PDB file of C-alpha atoms and ligand atoms in Angstrom:
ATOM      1  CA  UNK A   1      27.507   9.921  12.668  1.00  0.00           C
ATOM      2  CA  UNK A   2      24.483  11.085  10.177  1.00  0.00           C
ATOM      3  CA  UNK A   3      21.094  10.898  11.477  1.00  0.00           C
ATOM      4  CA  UNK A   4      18.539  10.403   8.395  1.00  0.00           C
ATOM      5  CA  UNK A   5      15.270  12.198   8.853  1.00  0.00           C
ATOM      6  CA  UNK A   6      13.673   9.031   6.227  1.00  0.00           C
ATOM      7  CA  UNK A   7      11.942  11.530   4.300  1.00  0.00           C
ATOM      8  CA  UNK A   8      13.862  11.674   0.988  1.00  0.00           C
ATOM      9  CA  UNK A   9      11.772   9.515  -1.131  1.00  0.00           C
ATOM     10  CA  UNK A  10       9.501  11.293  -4.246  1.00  0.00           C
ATOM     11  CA  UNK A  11       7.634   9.733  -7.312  1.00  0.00           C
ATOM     12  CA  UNK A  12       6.186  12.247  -9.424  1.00  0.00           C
ATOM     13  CA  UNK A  13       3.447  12.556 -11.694  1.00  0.00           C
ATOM     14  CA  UNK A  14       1.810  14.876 -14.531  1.00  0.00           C
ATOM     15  CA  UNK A  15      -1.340  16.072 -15.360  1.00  0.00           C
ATOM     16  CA  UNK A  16      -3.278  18.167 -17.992  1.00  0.00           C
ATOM     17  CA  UNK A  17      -6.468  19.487 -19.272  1.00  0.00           C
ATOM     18  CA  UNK A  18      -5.945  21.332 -22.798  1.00  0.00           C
ATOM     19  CA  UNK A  19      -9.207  21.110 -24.483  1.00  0.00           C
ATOM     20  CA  UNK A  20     -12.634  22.215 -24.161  1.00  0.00           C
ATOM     21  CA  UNK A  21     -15.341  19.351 -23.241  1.00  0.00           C
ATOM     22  CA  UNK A  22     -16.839  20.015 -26.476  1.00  0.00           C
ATOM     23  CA  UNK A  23     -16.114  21.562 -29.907  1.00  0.00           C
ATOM     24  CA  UNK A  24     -19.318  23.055 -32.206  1.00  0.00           C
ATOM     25  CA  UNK A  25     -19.133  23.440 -35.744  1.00  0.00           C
ATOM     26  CA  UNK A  26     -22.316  24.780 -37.688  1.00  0.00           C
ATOM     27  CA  UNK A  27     -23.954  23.753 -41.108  1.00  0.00           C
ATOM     28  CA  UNK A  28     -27.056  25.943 -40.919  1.00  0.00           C
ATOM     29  CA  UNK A  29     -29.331  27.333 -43.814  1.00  0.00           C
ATOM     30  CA  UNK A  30     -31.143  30.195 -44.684  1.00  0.00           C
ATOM     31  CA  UNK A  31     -35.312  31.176 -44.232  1.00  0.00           C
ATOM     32  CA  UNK A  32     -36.424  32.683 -47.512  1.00  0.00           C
ATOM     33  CA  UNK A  33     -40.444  33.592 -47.325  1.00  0.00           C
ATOM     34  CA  UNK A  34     -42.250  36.255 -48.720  1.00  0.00           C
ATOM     35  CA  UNK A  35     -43.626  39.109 -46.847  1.00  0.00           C
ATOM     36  CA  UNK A  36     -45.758  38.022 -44.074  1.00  0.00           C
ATOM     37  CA  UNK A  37     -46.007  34.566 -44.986  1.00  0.00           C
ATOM     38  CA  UNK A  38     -46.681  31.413 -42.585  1.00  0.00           C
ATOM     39  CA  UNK A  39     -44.402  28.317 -43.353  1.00  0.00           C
ATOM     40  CA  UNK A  40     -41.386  26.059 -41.529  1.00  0.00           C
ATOM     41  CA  UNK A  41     -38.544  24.623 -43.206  1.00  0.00           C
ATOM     42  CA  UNK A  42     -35.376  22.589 -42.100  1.00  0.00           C
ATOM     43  CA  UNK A  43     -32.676  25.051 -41.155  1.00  0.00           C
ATOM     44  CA  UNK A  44     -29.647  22.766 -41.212  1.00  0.00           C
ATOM     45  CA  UNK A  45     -27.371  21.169 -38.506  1.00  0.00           C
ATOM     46  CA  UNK A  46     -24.491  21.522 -35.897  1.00  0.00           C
ATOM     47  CA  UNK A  47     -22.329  18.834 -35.702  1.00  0.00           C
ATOM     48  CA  UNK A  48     -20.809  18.622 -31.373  1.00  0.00           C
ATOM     49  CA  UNK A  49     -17.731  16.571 -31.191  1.00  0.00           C
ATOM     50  CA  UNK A  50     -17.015  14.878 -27.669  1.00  0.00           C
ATOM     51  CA  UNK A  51     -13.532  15.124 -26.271  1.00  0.00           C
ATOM     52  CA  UNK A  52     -11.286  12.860 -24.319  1.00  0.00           C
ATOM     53  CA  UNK A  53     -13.333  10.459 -21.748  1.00  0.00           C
ATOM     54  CA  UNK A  54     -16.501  13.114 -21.577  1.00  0.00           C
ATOM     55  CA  UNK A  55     -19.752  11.097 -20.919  1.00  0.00           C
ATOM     56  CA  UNK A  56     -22.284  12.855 -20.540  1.00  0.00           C
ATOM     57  CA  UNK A  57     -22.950  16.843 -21.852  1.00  0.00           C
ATOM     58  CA  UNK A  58     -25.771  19.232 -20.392  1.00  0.00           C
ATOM     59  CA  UNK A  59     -25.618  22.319 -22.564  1.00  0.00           C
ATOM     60  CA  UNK A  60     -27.488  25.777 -22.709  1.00  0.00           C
TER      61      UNK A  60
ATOM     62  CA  UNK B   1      50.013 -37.854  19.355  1.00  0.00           C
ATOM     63  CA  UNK B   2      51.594 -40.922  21.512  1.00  0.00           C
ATOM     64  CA  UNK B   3      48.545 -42.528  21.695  1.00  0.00           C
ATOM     65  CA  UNK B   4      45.904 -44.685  19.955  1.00  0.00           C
ATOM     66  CA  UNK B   5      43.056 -42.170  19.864  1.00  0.00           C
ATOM     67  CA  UNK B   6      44.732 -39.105  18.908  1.00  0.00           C
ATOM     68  CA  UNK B   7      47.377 -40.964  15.801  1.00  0.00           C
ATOM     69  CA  UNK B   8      47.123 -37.728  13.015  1.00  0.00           C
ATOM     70  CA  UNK B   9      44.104 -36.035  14.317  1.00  0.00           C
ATOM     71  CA  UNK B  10      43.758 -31.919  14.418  1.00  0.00           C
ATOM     72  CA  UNK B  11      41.210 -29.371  15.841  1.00  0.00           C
ATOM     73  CA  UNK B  12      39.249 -26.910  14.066  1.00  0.00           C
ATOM     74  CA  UNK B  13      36.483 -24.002  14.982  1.00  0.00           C
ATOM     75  CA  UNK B  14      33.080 -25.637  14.456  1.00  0.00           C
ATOM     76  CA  UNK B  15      31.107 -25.613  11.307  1.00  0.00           C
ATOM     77  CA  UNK B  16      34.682 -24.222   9.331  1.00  0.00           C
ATOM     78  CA  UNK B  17      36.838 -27.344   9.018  1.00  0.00           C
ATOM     79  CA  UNK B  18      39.475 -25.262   6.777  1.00  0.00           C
ATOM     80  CA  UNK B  19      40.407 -23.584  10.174  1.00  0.00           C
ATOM     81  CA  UNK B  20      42.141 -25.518  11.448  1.00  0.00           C
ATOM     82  CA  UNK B  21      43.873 -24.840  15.726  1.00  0.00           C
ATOM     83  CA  UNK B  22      46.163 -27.619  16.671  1.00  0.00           C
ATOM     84  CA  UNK B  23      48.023 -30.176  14.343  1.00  0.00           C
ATOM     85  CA  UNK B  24      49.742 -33.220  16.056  1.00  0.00           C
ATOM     86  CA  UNK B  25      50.929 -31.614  18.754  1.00  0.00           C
ATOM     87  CA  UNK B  26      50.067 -31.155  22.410  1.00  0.00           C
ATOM     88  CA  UNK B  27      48.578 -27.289  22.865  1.00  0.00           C
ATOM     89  CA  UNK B  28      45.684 -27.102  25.122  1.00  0.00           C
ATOM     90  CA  UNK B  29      43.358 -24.599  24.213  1.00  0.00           C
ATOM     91  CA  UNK B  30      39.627 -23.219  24.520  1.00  0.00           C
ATOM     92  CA  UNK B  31      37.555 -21.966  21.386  1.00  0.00           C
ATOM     93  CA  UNK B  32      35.257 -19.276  22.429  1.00  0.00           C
ATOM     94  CA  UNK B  33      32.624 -18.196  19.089  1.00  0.00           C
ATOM     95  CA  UNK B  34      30.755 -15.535  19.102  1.00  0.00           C
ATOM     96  CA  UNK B  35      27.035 -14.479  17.764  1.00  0.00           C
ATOM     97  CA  UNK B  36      25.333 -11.660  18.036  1.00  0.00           C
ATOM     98  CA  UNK B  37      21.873 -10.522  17.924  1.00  0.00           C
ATOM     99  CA  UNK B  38      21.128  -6.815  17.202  1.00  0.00           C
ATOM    100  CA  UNK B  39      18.748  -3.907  16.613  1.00  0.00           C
ATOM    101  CA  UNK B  40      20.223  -0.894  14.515  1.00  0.00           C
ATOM    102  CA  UNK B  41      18.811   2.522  15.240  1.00  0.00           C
ATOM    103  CA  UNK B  42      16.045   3.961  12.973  1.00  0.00           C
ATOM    104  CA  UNK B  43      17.695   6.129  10.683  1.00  0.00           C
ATOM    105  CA  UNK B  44      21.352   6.064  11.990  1.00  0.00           C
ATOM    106  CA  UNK B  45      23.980   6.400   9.688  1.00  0.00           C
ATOM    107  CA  UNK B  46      27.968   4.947  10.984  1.00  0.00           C
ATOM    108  CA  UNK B  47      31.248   3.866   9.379  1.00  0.00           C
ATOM    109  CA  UNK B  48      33.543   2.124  11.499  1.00  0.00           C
ATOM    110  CA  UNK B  49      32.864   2.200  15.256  1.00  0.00           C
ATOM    111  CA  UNK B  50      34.779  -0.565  17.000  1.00  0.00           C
ATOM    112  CA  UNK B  51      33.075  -3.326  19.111  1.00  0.00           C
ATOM    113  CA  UNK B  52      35.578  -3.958  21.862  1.00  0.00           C
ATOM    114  CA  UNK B  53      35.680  -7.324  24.095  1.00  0.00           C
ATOM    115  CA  UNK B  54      38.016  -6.987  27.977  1.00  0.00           C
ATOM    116  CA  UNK B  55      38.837 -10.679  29.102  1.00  0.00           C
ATOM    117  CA  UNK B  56      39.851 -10.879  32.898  1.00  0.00           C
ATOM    118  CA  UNK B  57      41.420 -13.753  34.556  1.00  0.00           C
ATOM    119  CA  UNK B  58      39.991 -14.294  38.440  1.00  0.00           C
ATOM    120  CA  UNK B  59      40.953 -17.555  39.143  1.00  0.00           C
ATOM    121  CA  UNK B  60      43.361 -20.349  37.957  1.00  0.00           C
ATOM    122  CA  UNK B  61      43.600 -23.772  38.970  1.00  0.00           C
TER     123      UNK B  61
HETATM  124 CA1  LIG C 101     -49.262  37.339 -42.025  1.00  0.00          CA
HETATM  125 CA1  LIG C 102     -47.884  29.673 -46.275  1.00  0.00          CA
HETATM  126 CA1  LIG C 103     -16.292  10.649 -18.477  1.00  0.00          CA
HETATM  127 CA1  LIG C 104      45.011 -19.886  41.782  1.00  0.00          CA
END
């Protein structure tokens, strides 16, 4: 009569990436010396937010 | 029925004592049951195909 092949049987799934491992926002200052002068000063910060289940980071 | 043994007695198939054969009266008869023991093909697919018993009488005392 009807001879099943046994192969009609599924479970599916999704998956997705839609963000970047990391996202850089920047709070940085300003160097003001005079002409030719030698000094150092604190320049600011950069705040790096970690995404979803990201661990470790090795940036350039 | 006539007799001590047999006063309001019946028959019945085995294990299904609403069936019942014979009731008081004198009928001689032989229940034959049937089991069977089976392995369906892998994947096949059927309805309504008939399973089909032939009974022949060879001798009769
Ligand atoms: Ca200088
Ligand atoms: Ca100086
Ligand atoms: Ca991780
Ligand atoms: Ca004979």
């Amino acid at each position: 009569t009807t001879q099943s092949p046994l192969n009609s049987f599924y479970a599916t799934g999704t998956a997705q990436a839609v963000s970047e491992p990391i996202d850089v926002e920047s709070h940085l200052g300003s160097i003001t010396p005079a002409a030719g002068a030698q000094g150092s000063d604190d320049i600011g910060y950069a705040i790096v937010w970690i995404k979803d289940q990201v661990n470790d980071v090795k940036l350039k | 029925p006539d007799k001590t043994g047999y006063t309001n007695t019946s028959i019945w198939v085995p294990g299904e004592p609403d069936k019942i054969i014979v009731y008081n009266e004198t009928k001689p008869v032989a229940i034959l049951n049937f089991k069977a023991f089976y392995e369906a093909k892998e994947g096949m697919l059927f309805d309504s195909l008939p399973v089909i018993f032939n009974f022949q009488v060879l001798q009769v005392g």
